[PDB]
Design a protein around this ligand. Sequence first.
Ligand code: ATP
Ligand code: ATP
Ligand code: ATP
Ligand code: ATP
Ligand code: ATP
Ligand code: ATP
Ligand code: MG
Ligand code: MG
Ligand code: MG
Ligand code: MG
Ligand code: MG
Ligand code: MG
Ligand code: MG
Ligand code: MG
Lengths: 309, 309, 309, 309, 309, 309
Amino acid sequence: PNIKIFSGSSHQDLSQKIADRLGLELGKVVTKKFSNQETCVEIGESVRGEDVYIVQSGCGEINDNLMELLIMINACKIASASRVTAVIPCFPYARQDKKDKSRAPISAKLVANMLSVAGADHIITMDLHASQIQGFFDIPVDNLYAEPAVLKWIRENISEWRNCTIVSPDAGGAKRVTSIADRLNVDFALIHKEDRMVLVGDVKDRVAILVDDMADTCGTICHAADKLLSAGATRVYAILTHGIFSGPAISRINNACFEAVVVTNTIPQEDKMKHCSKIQVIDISMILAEAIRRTHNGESVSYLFSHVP
Amino acid sequence: PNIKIFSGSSHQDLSQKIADRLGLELGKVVTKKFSNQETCVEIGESVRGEDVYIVQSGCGEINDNLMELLIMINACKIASASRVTAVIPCFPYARQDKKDKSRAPISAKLVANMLSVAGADHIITMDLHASQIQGFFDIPVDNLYAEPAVLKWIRENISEWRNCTIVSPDAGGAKRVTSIADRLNVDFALIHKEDRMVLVGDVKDRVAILVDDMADTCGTICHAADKLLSAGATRVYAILTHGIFSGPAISRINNACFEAVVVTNTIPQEDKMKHCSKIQVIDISMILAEAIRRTHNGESVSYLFSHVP
Amino acid sequence: PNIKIFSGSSHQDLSQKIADRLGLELGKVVTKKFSNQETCVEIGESVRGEDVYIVQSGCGEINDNLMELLIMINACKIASASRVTAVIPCFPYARQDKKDKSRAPISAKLVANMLSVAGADHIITMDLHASQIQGFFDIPVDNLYAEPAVLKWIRENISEWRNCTIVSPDAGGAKRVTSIADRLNVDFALIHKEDRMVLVGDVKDRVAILVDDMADTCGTICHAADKLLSAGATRVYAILTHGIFSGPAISRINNACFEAVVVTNTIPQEDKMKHCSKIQVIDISMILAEAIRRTHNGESVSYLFSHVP
Amino acid sequence: PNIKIFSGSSHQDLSQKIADRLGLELGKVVTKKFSNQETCVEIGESVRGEDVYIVQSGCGEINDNLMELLIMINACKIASASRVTAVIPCFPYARQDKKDKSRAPISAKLVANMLSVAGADHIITMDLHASQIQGFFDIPVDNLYAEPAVLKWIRENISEWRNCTIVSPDAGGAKRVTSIADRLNVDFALIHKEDRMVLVGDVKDRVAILVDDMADTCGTICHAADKLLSAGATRVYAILTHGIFSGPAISRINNACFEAVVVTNTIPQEDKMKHCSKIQVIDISMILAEAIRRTHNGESVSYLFSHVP
Amino acid sequence: PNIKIFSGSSHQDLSQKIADRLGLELGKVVTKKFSNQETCVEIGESVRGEDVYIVQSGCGEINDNLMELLIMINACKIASASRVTAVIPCFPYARQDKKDKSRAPISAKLVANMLSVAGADHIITMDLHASQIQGFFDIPVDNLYAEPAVLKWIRENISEWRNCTIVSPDAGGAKRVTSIADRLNVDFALIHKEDRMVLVGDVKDRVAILVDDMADTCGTICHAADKLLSAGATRVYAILTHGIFSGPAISRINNACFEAVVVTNTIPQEDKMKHCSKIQVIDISMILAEAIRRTHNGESVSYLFSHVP
Amino acid sequence: PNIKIFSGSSHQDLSQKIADRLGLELGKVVTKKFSNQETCVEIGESVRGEDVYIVQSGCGEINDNLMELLIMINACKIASASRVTAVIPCFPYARQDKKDKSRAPISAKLVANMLSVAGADHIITMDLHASQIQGFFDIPVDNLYAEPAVLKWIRENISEWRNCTIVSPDAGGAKRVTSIADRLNVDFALIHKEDRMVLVGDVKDRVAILVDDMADTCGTICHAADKLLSAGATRVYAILTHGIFSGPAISRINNACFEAVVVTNTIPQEDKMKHCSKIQVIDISMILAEAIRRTHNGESVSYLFSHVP
Ligand SMILES: Nc1ncnc2c1ncn2[C@@H]1O[C@H](COP(=O)(O)OP(=O)(O)OP(=O)(O)O)[C@@H](O)[C@H]1O
Ligand SMILES: Nc1ncnc2c1ncn2[C@@H]1O[C@H](COP(=O)(O)OP(=O)(O)OP(=O)(O)O)[C@@H](O)[C@H]1O
Ligand SMILES: Nc1ncnc2c1ncn2[C@@H]1O[C@H](COP(=O)(O)OP(=O)(O)OP(=O)(O)O)[C@@H](O)[C@H]1O
Ligand SMILES: Nc1ncnc2c1ncn2[C@@H]1O[C@H](COP(=O)(O)OP(=O)(O)OP(=O)(O)O)[C@@H](O)[C@H]1O
Ligand SMILES: Nc1ncnc2c1ncn2[C@@H]1O[C@H](COP(=O)(O)OP(=O)(O)OP(=O)(O)O)[C@@H](O)[C@H]1O
Ligand SMILES: Nc1ncnc2c1ncn2[C@@H]1O[C@H](COP(=O)(O)OP(=O)(O)OP(=O)(O)O)[C@@H](O)[C@H]1O
Ligand SMILES: [Mg+2]
Ligand SMILES: [Mg+2]
Ligand SMILES: [Mg+2]
Ligand SMILES: [Mg+2]
Ligand SMILES: [Mg+2]
Ligand SMILES: [Mg+2]
Ligand SMILES: [Mg+2]
Ligand SMILES: [Mg+2]
């Protein structure tokens, strides 16, 4: 059983980077639309008895990409692939992980059920919005972390990183920032709203680094950055694993005081970089490629939680 | 347990017509998109212990509508609805009902599995592309027929209907046309391609009526109509239950010789009628409403296969 | 189909209170242990065609109680009960809702799967540790809130409640306290550890009310209370929906500065009240009884999120 | 994991031919009936960790053979076989693949469900009546085609094959005949009933070859052959992949004008050949053996759609 | 939801008796065979929203009857019956309930799985060979007992019943006979083989009554009766709930010393009574009818374990 | 894929013996209790792609051990183990394998369902109380037999074993004793209660050996031994595969006439041996180790039914 990497249409550059790091060519697949806009998928090579990995992120036209992924999984499964793995760098509907006093769907659970029923045997993803989403599955889920790559970027790009403060934009992400603060041996601050925000932790004359899983409309991080500059911070960075940047995010970032907005490439960023000078991209294709290769060879994946490959 | 009718965003006029025929108001639901284009659904009223019917056709932005339907089904199911029924007038991915010497998905089966796993207890649909799709489910599926309404339209709109010929555009649909030919006591002709088409059955000086389940790009029916005019037909009609009309269909119909292109309203048609004068719409909301009401009350649904309500 | 309420051995007083509020007698069931300590269950009355509710909390001997609940559910399901509902005021293994960089089980998901496979059709619980646990099920889950009863207690027991500060012991519970702070129109403070704790929000000369879902060993709330007294608070209360009080909790509370430690009766408290004077109990049996009665009659359960019955 | 081939009682000659082509001996199994006519199955060798293939066609005493197959699958699955594959050359109940305005079962779907629940991991079959039956499964199904062997037979047995006409007995099978007509570069004709039949396509002074998936009572092919002789055909052949030949088929064929009735050996034919001189048998055991060997070794099976091995 | 009783072809007299006791007519169903011997089923009336009971015993052509039952269940389930119950007086493959050091199927479990996957919601049966078969299902199973009817027959037909001895033919059935011996206040004896049999319990000058669940070949009961006459018994009776009587059973009974061989009518007996004078039939249609009516109305079924209705 | 053996807390000595016989070290796992007595499990090494065997018997605190086993299975399954096998020497709730005229659970079936839903792929157990429990699973179950080890012990410990009588304590176990009696070529006796017991078979001046699957309270075997001494037996032995010894068993055995009470070590016995001199232990760790090694290597397990390794 050999590795076969297939790309959905969502993030083809990431799939190519992963394939190069694995020393493989992308599997032959046609993924287009019929005239009535139904997804058309044709696997152009035999996957019989192979270990198939389908790379598709929850970005762009999310429902189209999700249906493409489900259809590709189904096609590979009924084509007698030995194992089918969904590599989903940004998990769609992850923020709908609970009801919370509303007659709302748990869309993340529905997506997990659909992936299971399509025939996925395994899920590889990066920085799930809530790690409880792992429990939405009955198949194994490897939730990778961008934190090693983030730490690497911080050390090689922020000269004052030993005196910086890692800041959570809200009370929800504090855990994450504390982890980073532990790995860098720096202070960590929290910010939460009472339209006013309150900040705990000295940030004067120090570089502040907001850290988060995602930036969708960037209202949260822009408000946090305004507060950090109010409290005497020297420069404010924002580091996010998922740069969705929908709606007014680009305009707000352009009008914000960030020195840089670093995001990983779990979502393609070329279009946003055109209209926003301060967006920078961390490659995480090495982490994804190593996770694929370790799941295939039966090596430890959790080794990657703390080690940059 | 009362009837609750909910509308997806795909076909709101049809849902309203069904609700009026049932003497009900449409259930309060918010169906919009988040900024990153994920579907947002909020059920605005309690559905606890109710018989819920969600109306959504496989039309327009098909993957968006399908995800909306799945999310709404999930929301109603975890909101403790007694029973959830999907009313899908045009079934999405119905034409991908087999592989046939290709490494292709069976997308119709995947859609059926997704509907089941979302929590659908029952499916109501009209003129499935292949009735074998009923076997793709383990829940009951009521596949209604537009044929009674088509027969009614033919009798009240074609003055020469007693001397007409019902024509299949291809060998696949012959069964359907024979059924119609049996109910009208008229001749039935077949047409199949060898770029040339061959026609069996006298059509000279007689009105010809092409009959089909759907018109997507209308290449099939336009070629058939050209052949029918070649063979001396007086006027050529086309009657289809599903008017998808994607791609170049409107231009081809405008350049074709059809007296009329009659379609049911399983798919909204207002935009197409603007650009195509010869499209006409049969209302089938009475059939759908009667099917909903009969499934709710435990009356016979198959009664509708031959009776216009 | 009538309501049948059955009690597990974990919390018989709560089951009796619920049964009285419903105007019913507890169903005849024998729940003992065989000599080799296997659970023995015998349903002493016919439950055929009935709406069965089994009350069992995740307290005391947790694995014994959980197995008792599963066995009782199975016995009722194979005895042809029309519907079986598990009323689990405190959900066992709720704190094991994720893996988080550890080769650990997701025990909450396992418990959900076991409840589903035993035959539960519905779950009623109170203040799930994480509401994402709702997504661990495919059956409906009604997660009730003790907040209405807590607000009632605060108003009728704390004379200075209009000038009080609602305090979260950690960043995780802030949402909850904000909700309470919104319903009382008072200030809300956060506390988080950097062995030192940092507090945001004025608490001097004001009554402080720590709020939380559970108190197991009470290290968190005792440290928070020490910090609140350091910051000039007048009196410190603690209000928790689940009073587990395991390990050294009673000694720590006895040595702490709390004016009172209010907990709901989702877990029996009589033994702890003997050794701890400042524990007080809020009855939530009315909320549970109303939820049972509303699920049975098909009325709105979410009505209870904001209304004391 | 090695190949183990087991024979049901339905078609032992085919199983032996497949085993010889694989270079294997048939696995030791006892398949008899108890006194009360219940199937008795005993696997006479260990299948632990093996790739098991059970050969059983839907022929003869169909319900007995189907139950034998299910029981053998179950016995191998609980005996810890690594993988169990059902090799079903003629799929039982394949013609009950839809309801079609009748309160009828979808028996093909029921058979698929029973095969899945017995523990089949994979299905190998030949010329499914409708390829939509593939969607009735969630396990992979390889639907082989007798067409390569049919083309070989036509070329080596019909001297005038370059000037022949391939004829469909009905509108349903046209696809199949067109495929054959494409591979031979000959004309293709259709025949359909209006008790009268209409034929399109010149057949005078040319050899006609009716092609079909199965012949049960042979009314269809006998009527088609009568019509072909009416239209001036020189000789009429019939080629079917499944020679069921039930009821009056043998008498009708004996009284028909066929030069030969060629069928594959998916169903044993020795008894029918005794009473019908013009039946001839194509061996397809090479196709089945190659499909088994390619599924075992992870090679391409679809290679066989166009290549005789 | 009303009761609908449908008969399979296995035991039509029993179905009619049950229908008369329920005050109902048998539901319109066609159950025949296609030419190729596949089961053909057509439900001749709407079962939508009804409580359907299908009566079919594991007798005669067992695999044909079992397939008929599965097909009828499937037809009713996809016809939107509210509930489908299989009434199986004699459960097929019940004696294959374990493997026991053999590479054998557990055919009873396979049958249970097939019944569940066909769509059965409930099973009613009489005197399961092993009551552990109840655990083979996940749906409720009501296993009725012929013992009340047997006790009635014994009292009204054996004048010396107060001084009789109830005898088990083997060690396996002892429980059953003890139950009967308890309800009659008589002695109970056991017989087991060491070709020789050993009997415990005085039987001289007393009427002996062998009791058993089934008689297939009647070797067991004939050997037991020979031993009982050896030990000085006056008359020997045999009472069995299931009179299968396959193979040489009729000849052996004719050559045996039984005064009577009483069996219930879970299996049709008219043909066997023609060739065997000493077979007598107990009607158990009242027990089956009462069980159906009590499951429908939600009354206690276990009431029937001790009460003749 | 390598063998990984993990021990639950129930029987660590047995797990160590098995690990030594396999030439392996026990896998690193932490199995403790949280403060509130919930099971805490942490797998201390990667099990990705491994063949995992978890050893846990149904002994001691049965519900705690069962929950530990389920949690460990779940942890290994979501840690991407290739295969997870539960090695359960004494199966919990095995005696609750049926309902039998009681509104009781089938707890054995519930346990089987829970093991399956936790993710077990395979079960290895010894002397199931009823072999029908094998049918409670859909995964393969290997039910090993202590009989080879028992025969070995009898030959090497009872000098008069050629003239002994193997005695069943009840009618239920007769099969077992007959098997042993066949393998030793000795007489076999039965004992059953009418408070009086009746014995068939000469036992005077001969050593008697009671044989059974388990001894819980030892009332059965103590009464049987009293009867055997009444009937002139010289010495009475008892041999049981499962020595549960709960309740008053130790006192009764101490007051009984047994020469020895031999049990296997499927359950730890050190504590009972302290208070009971006549308990002796047969090691069956070789049988379990050989079964594990044969399932891993795909060799025959049933070879062990008759051969001591
Ligand atoms: N794609 C989306 N875009 C925007 N909002 C979304 C999206 N999906 C869900 N939501 C909504 O966003 C809210 C969830 O917000 P968020 O995840 O930031 O906070 P939380 O879950 O309440 O708390 P926290 O993550 O801090 O523990 C819900 O109301 C949910 O319905
Ligand atoms: N939405 C779609 N639009 C266009 N083509 C589609 C769509 N979905 C599937 N197809 C393709 O269309 C083909 C199916 O065509 P069609 O249903 O007209 O004929 P058929 O199934 O071969 O025969 P028939 O319906 O006459 O029995 C397949 O190749 C399928 O992949
Ligand atoms: N019964 C239990 N008693 C104590 N600790 C437990 C128990 N069950 C699980 N845990 C452990 O407690 C930790 C979970 O702690 P907790 O719920 O307080 O914080 P969190 O989930 O990390 O964050 P938060 O709830 O603030 O969002 C995990 O390490 C888990 O293994
Ligand atoms: N074993 C059988 N023998 C005979 N008739 C059968 C059998 N099984 C099902 N049938 C019936 O035969 C009919 C199906 O016929 P057939 O497959 O020839 O045509 P179709 O499915 O209507 O169309 P087509 O295959 O041309 O697209 C149905 O009425 C079905 O109930
Ligand atoms: N229909 C059948 N006719 C005859 N024998 C059968 C049938 N089905 C299974 N058997 C076989 O009969 C045997 C089962 O026999 P039986 O039920 O009389 O005894 P048991 O299960 O060993 O013990 P007991 O029922 O006394 O506890 C098995 O070998 C089984 O394979
Ligand atoms: N752990 C247990 N300890 C004691 N009794 C139990 C236990 N579990 C179940 N029981 C009860 O013990 C009885 C089962 O007894 P037992 O297995 O000895 O006999 P049986 O199943 O009736 O017949 P036999 O095994 O001889 O065929 C049932 O009433 C069951 O509820
Ligand atoms: Mg969130
Ligand atoms: Mg956030
Ligand atoms: Mg088609
Ligand atoms: Mg078509
Ligand atoms: Mg907390
Ligand atoms: Mg045909
Ligand atoms: Mg018997
Ligand atoms: Mg016993």
